[PDB]
Amino acid sequence: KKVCQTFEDHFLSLQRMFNNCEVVLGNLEITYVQRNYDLSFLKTIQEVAGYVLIALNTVERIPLENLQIIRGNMYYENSYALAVLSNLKELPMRNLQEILHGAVRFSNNPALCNVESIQWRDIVSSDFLSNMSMDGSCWGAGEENCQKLTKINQCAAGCTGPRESDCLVCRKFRDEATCKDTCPPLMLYNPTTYQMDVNPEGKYSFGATCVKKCPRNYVVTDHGSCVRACGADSYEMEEDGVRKCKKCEGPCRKVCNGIGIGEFKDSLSINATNIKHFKNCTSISGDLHILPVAFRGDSFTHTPPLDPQELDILKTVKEITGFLLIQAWPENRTDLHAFENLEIIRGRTKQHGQFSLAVVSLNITSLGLRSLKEISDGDVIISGNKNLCYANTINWKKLFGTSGQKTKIISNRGENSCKATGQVCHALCSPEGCWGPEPRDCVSCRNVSRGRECVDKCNLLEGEPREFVENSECIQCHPECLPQAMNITCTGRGPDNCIQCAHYIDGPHCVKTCPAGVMGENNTLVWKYADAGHVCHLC
Amino acid sequence: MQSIKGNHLVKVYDYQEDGSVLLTCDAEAKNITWFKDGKMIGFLTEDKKKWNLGSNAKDPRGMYQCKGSQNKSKPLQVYYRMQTPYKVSISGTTVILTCPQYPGSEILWQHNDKNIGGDEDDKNIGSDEDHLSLKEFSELEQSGYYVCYPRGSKPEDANFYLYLRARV
Amino acid sequence: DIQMTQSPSSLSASVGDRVTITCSASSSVSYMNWYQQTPGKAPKRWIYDTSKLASGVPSRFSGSGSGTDYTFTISSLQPEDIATYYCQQWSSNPFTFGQGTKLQITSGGGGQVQLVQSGAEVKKPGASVKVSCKASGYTFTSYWMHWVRQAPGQGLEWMGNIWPGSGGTNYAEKFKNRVTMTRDTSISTAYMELSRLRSDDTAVYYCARSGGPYFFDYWGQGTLVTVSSDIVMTQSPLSLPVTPGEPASISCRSSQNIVHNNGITYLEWYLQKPGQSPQLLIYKVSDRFSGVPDRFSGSGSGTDFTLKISRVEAEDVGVYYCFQGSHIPPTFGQGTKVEIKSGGGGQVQLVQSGGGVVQPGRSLRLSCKASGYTFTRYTMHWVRQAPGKGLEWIGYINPSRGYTNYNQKVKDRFTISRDNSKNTAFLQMDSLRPEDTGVYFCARYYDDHYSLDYWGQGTPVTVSS
């Protein structure tokens, strides 16, 4: 079945979007239809996976004869799925026998006839709390358009026999013929591997039917649903023949246009007008300058002065294609915390053709760019900062990518004076350098690294997280790994690389509880018991 | 004339019932010492403070100056007829006064704090260089304090004022 | 002649600090006079009789001394105290004035933003002229150097900007095809070249610097480029005269609503005092800029704006131009040349005239019209102020008697005359020499105060070939 997501213009758009529809994936809204302008623009639709909004319809008759079940994935305002209001004489809603979620509203329909006699009790399901049907089993159009009372367990509208393989509309989903309460699970747990595995028989969920693959432009979500587009907290990633909604790693890629190219083409700096157009942005395409005029405010460009607290919007920037030349920062801030999370400055375009990460004439105590790892093309000039102390420490040869990259770090706070004032790297830092006066702002860690922070030593033997060192970094062990005092508590990551298990141990892996009732191979639920040795034994 | 500013503390008391000339000293009264032509002529220890020059019929004349607790005041050229001083000449009823200091600048004259000798509309009052001519001099009207000073300078800045009393 | 020595020659003091100026005379002087002379103005008597402050002189100023030593004391130095202080003796002719103490405010150590233009440009029709503006005291790459022109008989008209940091210019439609502006970041100097000089381009073109909340904040000196063969804002008053102290008010009407989409009104009023480049007075629709007294207080909303001066003072004389920038090309109004109703009359006033540029050896006659007092009752004195030199007494004339006294340097070349029926004194200079170039000011000599209390505005005389 084909599925679908001026008065003349509205009618044309609705006829284009609902001519061939059989199951409506979103909400069917039939609103603002001119008189004697609709003619069978939508009659084959049989499943509305949302809300039916028939409002302000001047046309005399909207057929909607084939719509059997309106699911209720949303509501008009609240518990409002069928919205017949402010409209029309005959609406032969013949096949609609059940609306699963929501209620039907009747109001401001003086012209509507024979709809007041329809037994709405069967159509609505337990959502009578908002059943405002105030504006005999027959849907109009004389005879043969009867309400077909059937209600006043995977079949919603009605049954064509006492078999789940033959039902009009499935209650939750239908794999191919049988109405299943859930899709064939994507991951199946195998007692041999003691872990969930991708089941060949598992199928993704596409609306109200289980599909082995999601056709057209449909993305498989985490919960197995095949949504049209990935959510805000997810990203589109193709690993197999079907793309999946990969969860975003912090801020997801939202390539904005930088100052100089695009909407901010002729802008001079990051003015208050230019700001707030870069919120929740990463991989800013172009340069991203902060000239003094941004802080002062300008008249000939009619830009109000930028409050210092508004520079924190840029914190999400994880890359810059052009040059990131920050020539004036608010003096009340001691470190360039605005660009703290920057990771790579590709430097495709260079300020004056030379500099790619220039911080000139600021009053910042420390550069504060802890996350910066690569400055690809241009050179780097960090001068004029009379209070920058932890500056020359960082090995400028390590971060740069091109051999021609230089460094002109001069005129900052004296290194002799930096050491005299106690402004030196915290002892837990490798000789590569230090981005700031704190352990977190360390170019490389001397012994271990609990994340960005560089600790003296991981909790190999004693500690609350009980890390297990790996690649000169501390990784918090799996929660089931009970801490061990005689030796380390876990060889590596995962629940199967731990010596002592706080909870029960299932095969090689240590889990909170034994697998009980989980779906396994051959569509059989798996239940496992635990012995005195915390070993999870399959039943 | 009437004012004592400019160290011109010596003044003539014009309140005599008899024809006697009395001099007054405008200084902080502790003891008044009187001088005549530079020589000390008296020392008044409290009590009286005015200096009596005798009857006006004796034609008292001289440079009189007083002194209290401060320095001596400027001289008072007394000239009765019933440092270079002002020259007084009487011919019939005409009285001629000569400014002691005549460096060649425009010399102005003042009588009882009133300028005189400037306007040409006075036939009996003429000014010729450092000489002031008073024709048909009136004893009761033209007598009093006289002073000559150059244009631009203050009359009180003169070295001394001339007190003329003449019967013609 | 008694010689007056003033110490120090130039003193820099912070706002609120005590500034003491000493005056040494070659001979004992009975009375010493103190005058306050601001740049471009005539000296104003502050202290007379060596201890008495002139009328209107704040009590923070005090004079003291006797004989040959005199002291001038400012108890609390203020930004308004920036002026040239000169001491004068009146005991003997000629009236001798000291070299003058150039009093400057050390407060504000941060470089004073001072833009200097090229100036003095004379061209021919169809030619091209390039004018520069040496920006100093500020990072020339952090403020746009907007350039504005003020034609004779017309108000301020923006001529387009240039952002010296990047060289990316905007331009005015009336010159979009004629004028090009380029930056020179190395020397901190913007340049503006206007091509195809016409007759209507002869004007004074200035270099602004668009600040944060106000446009054309610190304006350059201004270049007069004389060549010869849009939200319209109208200022309701025009040449509206007021009386000294009497409140004045100029209204301005805009073609459309000058309320910007941002919600901030870029309406302003610049007060081009006579002979100076405009200085912002009302930075926004209501706000008054810093350094401007509370006398100026504008108002307005929508499209109507009017500026109300609380008390028209002596200084407020000059064409107050109203500019609106909330549109693309910022346009200024005609500007109301507020002038003193009394003028040369009313109170004691000396109107100086007859100045100009003359060739060496020629004769020039200056006139000083006195009104508001008996001309014959006071002496009229003439003083010359050479560029970079102190006050030099030329001579004086008594209107009552006609007696004249002149300085020995100009006695044989300058003749002082007077017209009692017109209450005007005449200073006739014959055989003019290059050393005679300067400002000639007439002053009224009050014998009761032994000081020149009322002085004329000064007449510039230039002896050039």
* DSSP assignment of A73-124: SS-SSSS--EEEE----B----S--EE-SS-EEEES-SS--SSTTS-HHHHB
Residue A522, helix vs strand vs coil: helix
Q: How far apart are CA A219 and CA A213, in angstroms?
A: 10
Helices and strands, counts by H and E, chain A: 5, 29
Shared domain for B66 and B115, answered yes or no, is no
* Cα torsion A176, A180, A182, A187: sign: negative
Shared domain for B119 and B50, answered yes or no, is no
| A446 within domain boundaries | no
The phi and psi torsions of A123 (rounded to 5 degrees) equal -65, -45
Q: How far apart are CA A253 and CA A230, in angstroms?
A: 13
Shared domain for A259 and A242, answered yes or no, is no
**Residues A118, A138 contacting (CB under 8 angstroms):** yes
Residue B140 DSSP one-character state:
H
Q: Taking chain B, what is the end-to-end CA distance rounded to the nearest angstrom?
A: 23
- Exposure of C271 in the CB half-sphere (CA atoms within 13 A): 25
**Residues B102, B108 contacting (CB under 8 angstroms):** no
Which helix or strand (DSSP H or E) is residue A234 part of? strand A234-238
Shared domain for B74 and B143, answered yes or no, is no
Q: How far apart are CA C341 and CA C96, in angstroms?
A: 35
Give residue B7's identity as a one-letter amino acid code: N
Shared domain for B77 and B5, answered yes or no, is yes
| A152 within domain boundaries | no
Shared domain for A223 and A323, answered yes or no, is no
List for chain B the helix, strand, coil content (%; round to 5): 5, 45, 45
Shared domain for A307 and A420, answered yes or no, is yes
Task: Indicate the pairing of strand B107-111 with strand B94-98.
Answer: unpaired
> CA C104, C106, C108 angle in degrees (round to 5)?
115
Measure Cα distances from A76 to A52, A53, A208, C281 in Å: 8, 7, 20, 58
Shared domain for A403 and A502, answered yes or no, is no
State the total domains in chain A.
Answer: 4
Residues in chain A: 539
Shared domain for B168 and B88, answered yes or no, is yes
CA A49 to centroid of chain Cα atoms:
22
Measure Cα distances from A476 to A166, A428, A455, A501 in Å: 52, 19, 13, 15
Cβ <8 Å between C210 and A266 = no
| A150 within domain boundaries | no
| A200 within domain boundaries | yes
| A225 within domain boundaries | yes
Residue B156, helix vs strand vs coil: helix
Which helix or strand (DSSP H or E) is residue A29 part of? strand A28-33
| A161 within domain boundaries | no
**A106-113 long-range contacts, Cβ below 8 Å, gap at least 24?**
A106/A132, A106/A133, A106/A134, A106/A135, A107/A132, A107/A134, A107/A135, A108/A135, A109/A84, A109/A85, A109/A135, A110/A135, A111/A60, A111/A87, A112/A84, A112/A87, A112/A88, A113/A89, A113/A140
* Cα torsion A391, A396, A401, A406: sign: positive
Shared domain for A324 and A194, answered yes or no, is no
Shared domain for A509 and A412, answered yes or no, is no
Paired strand residues for A173: A180
| A140 within domain boundaries | no
Domains of chain C and any CATH numbers: 4-105 (2.60.40.10), 114-227 (2.60.40.10), 233-271+284-338 (2.60.40.10), 349-463 (2.60.40.10)
Q: How far apart are CA A174 and CA A172, in angstroms?
A: 7
Shared domain for B71 and B94, answered yes or no, is no
Shared domain for B73 and B116, answered yes or no, is no
Question: After which residues do gaps appear in chain A, with C to N over 2.5 Å?
Answer: 5, 87, 135, 152
Measure Cα distances from C194 to C191, C201, C431 in Å: 10, 9, 42
Shared domain for B32 and B94, answered yes or no, is no
In the numeric block, which tokens belong to residue C422? 């017109």
Question: Which strand ranges, in their side-by-side order, compose the sheet holding C179-184?
Answer: C114-117, C129-136, C189-194, C179-184
Which of C158, C163, C328 would best serve as a mutation to test chain A binding (most A beta carbons within 10 A)? C163
Shared domain for A260 and A346, answered yes or no, is yes
In chain A, which residues have their Cβ closer than 8 Å to the Cβ of C214?
A: 299
In chain B, which residues have their Cβ closer than 8 Å to the Cβ of C403?
A: 106, 151
Residue A259 DSSP one-character state:
T
C8 upstream amide cis, omega within 30 of 0: yes
- Burial pattern C4-18, b for ≥16 Cβ within 10 A else e, equals bebeeeebebeeeee
Shared domain for B64 and B141, answered yes or no, is no
Q: Which residues of C touch B (CB under 8 A)?
A: 30, 90-91, 93, 398, 401, 403, 405, 447, 450
Experimental method: cryo-EM
Q: Which residues of C touch A (CB under 8 A)?
A: 139, 142-144, 146, 161, 163, 165-166, 168, 170, 210-215, 260, 262, 264, 266, 325-326, 330
Shared domain for B167 and B136, answered yes or no, is yes
Which helix or strand (DSSP H or E) is residue A415 part of? helix A415-420
Shared domain for B109 and B74, answered yes or no, is no
Q: How far apart are CA C121 and CA A16, in angstroms?
A: 71
**Residues C50, C73 contacting (CB under 8 angstroms):** no
Give the domain-ending residue among B82, B116, B137.
Answer: B82
Cβ <8 Å between C398 and B151 = yes
**Residues B166, B136 contacting (CB under 8 angstroms):** no
Residue B115, helix vs strand vs coil: strand
| Residue-number span of the structural domain to which B50 is assigned | 1-82
- Exposure of A307 in the CB half-sphere (CA atoms within 13 A): 4
Q: Taking chain C, what is the end-to-end CA distance rounded to the nearest angstrom?
A: 33
Shared domain for A217 and A126, answered yes or no, is no
- Exposure of A84 in the CB half-sphere (CA atoms within 13 A): 26
CATH number at residue A323: 3.80.20.20
Task: Indicate the pairing of strand A28-33 with strand A52-57.
Answer: parallel
In the numeric block, which tokens belong to residue A388? 């920058």
Give the domain-ending residue among A98, A115, A130.
Answer: A130
Give the domain-ending residue among A196, A222, A247.
Answer: A247
Question: Closest Cα partner for A142 from A108, A113, A111, A106?
Answer: A113
In the numeric block, which tokens belong to residue B20? 């006697």
Region for C453 from its dihedrals, namely left if φ exceeds 0, alpha if ψ lies in -120 to 50, beta otherwise = alpha
Q: How far apart are CA A120 and CA A82, in angstroms?
A: 11
Neighbours of C293 (CB within 10 A): 15
Query: For the CA atoms of B12, B16, B21, B25, what is the dihedral angle to 10 degrees?
Result: -40
| A146 within domain boundaries | no
Which residue in the set A266, A273, A305 is minimally distant from C212, CB to CB?
A: A305
Q: Taking chain A, what is the end-to-end CA distance rounded to the nearest angstrom?
A: 43
Q: How far apart are CA A103 and CA A99, in angstroms?
A: 8
| Residue-number span of the structural domain to which A121 is assigned | 3-130
Residue appearing with tokens 């200097």: C116
* Cα torsion C54, C60, C63, C64: sign: positive
Residue A374, helix vs strand vs coil: strand
Q: How far apart are CA A220 and CA C19, in angstroms?
A: 82
Neighbours of B163 (CB within 10 A): 25
> CA B143, B146, B148 angle in degrees (round to 5)?
155
Shared domain for B103 and B71, answered yes or no, is no
Give Dmax over CA atoms of chain C in angstroms.
71
- Exposure of A480 in the CB half-sphere (CA atoms within 13 A): 21
Shared domain for A414 and A503, answered yes or no, is no
Query: Which chains contact B through at least 3 pairs of Cβ atoms less than 8 Å apart?
Result: C
CA distance C15 to chain A (A): 26
**Residues A506, A494 contacting (CB under 8 angstroms):** no
Question: Closest Cα partner for A340 from A365, A363, A369, A316?
Answer: A369
In the numeric block, which tokens belong to residue C148? 């504005």
Name the resolution in angstroms: 3.4
Which of C142, C144, C265, C285 would best serve as a mutation to test chain A binding (most A beta carbons within 10 A)? C142
Q: How far apart are CA C392 and CA C86, in angstroms?
A: 11
**Residues C210, A299 contacting (CB under 8 angstroms):** yes
State the total domains in chain B.
Answer: 2
Q: How far apart are CA A135 and CA A441, in angstroms?
A: 68
Which helix or strand (DSSP H or E) is residue A47 part of? strand A47-48
Q: Which residues of A touch C (CB under 8 A)?
A: 266, 268, 273, 291-293, 296-300, 302, 304-305, 328, 361
Query: For the CA atoms of C228, C230, C231, C235, what is the dihedral angle to 10 degrees?
Result: 10
Give the domain-ending residue among B33, B66, B82.
Answer: B82
3-state SS, chain C, equals CCCEEEECCEEEECCCCCEEEEEEEEEEECCEEEEEECCCCCCEEEEECCCEECCCCCCCEEEEEEEEEEEEEECCCCHHHCCEEEEEECCCCCCEECCCEEEEECCCCCCCCEEEECCCEEECCCCCEEEEEEEECCCCCCCCCCEEEECCCCCEEECCCCECCCCECCCCHHHCCCEEEEEECCCCEEEEEECCCCHHHCEEEEECCCCCCCCCCCCCCCEEEEECCCCCEEECCCCCCECCCCCEEEEEEECCCCECCCCCECEEEEEECCCCCCEEEECCCCCECCCCCCCEEEEEECCEEEEEECCCCCCCCEEEEEEECCCCCCEECCCEEECECCCCCCCCEEEEECCEEECCCCCEEEEEEEECCCHHHCEEEEEEECCCCCEEEEEEECCCCCCEEECCCCCCCEEEEEECCCCEEEEEECCCCHHHCEEEEEEEEECCCCEEEEECCCEEEEECC
In the numeric block, which tokens belong to residue A286? 């172009």
Q: How far apart are CA A104 and CA A131, in angstroms?
A: 6
C94 upstream amide cis, omega within 30 of 0: yes
Burial class (CB in 10 A: 0-12, 13-18, 19+), B120: exposed
Q: How far apart are CA A460 and CA A165, in angstroms?
A: 58
Give the domain-ending residue among A68, A103, A130.
Answer: A130
In the numeric block, which tokens belong to residue A260? 């100089």
Q: How far apart are CA A131 and CA A128, in angstroms?
A: 5
CATH number at residue B13: 2.60.40.10
Neighbours of A82 (CB within 10 A): 27
Residues in chain B: 168
Measure Cα distances from C200 to C28, C154, C181, C194 in Å: 61, 11, 20, 13
Task: Indicate the pairing of strand A319-320 with strand A344-345.
Answer: parallel
Shared domain for A313 and A401, answered yes or no, is yes
Shared domain for A254 and A233, answered yes or no, is no
**Residues A128, A156 contacting (CB under 8 angstroms):** no
Q: How far apart are CA C278 and CA C273, in angstroms?
A: 7
Measure Cα distances from B150 to A528, B159, B160 in Å: 132, 12, 14
Shared domain for A415 and A280, answered yes or no, is yes
Say which residues have a Cβ less than 8 Å from residue C67's Cβ, sequence separation at least 6.
C25, C28, C29
Cβ <8 Å between A296 and C212 = yes
CA C146 to centroid of chain Cα atoms:
23
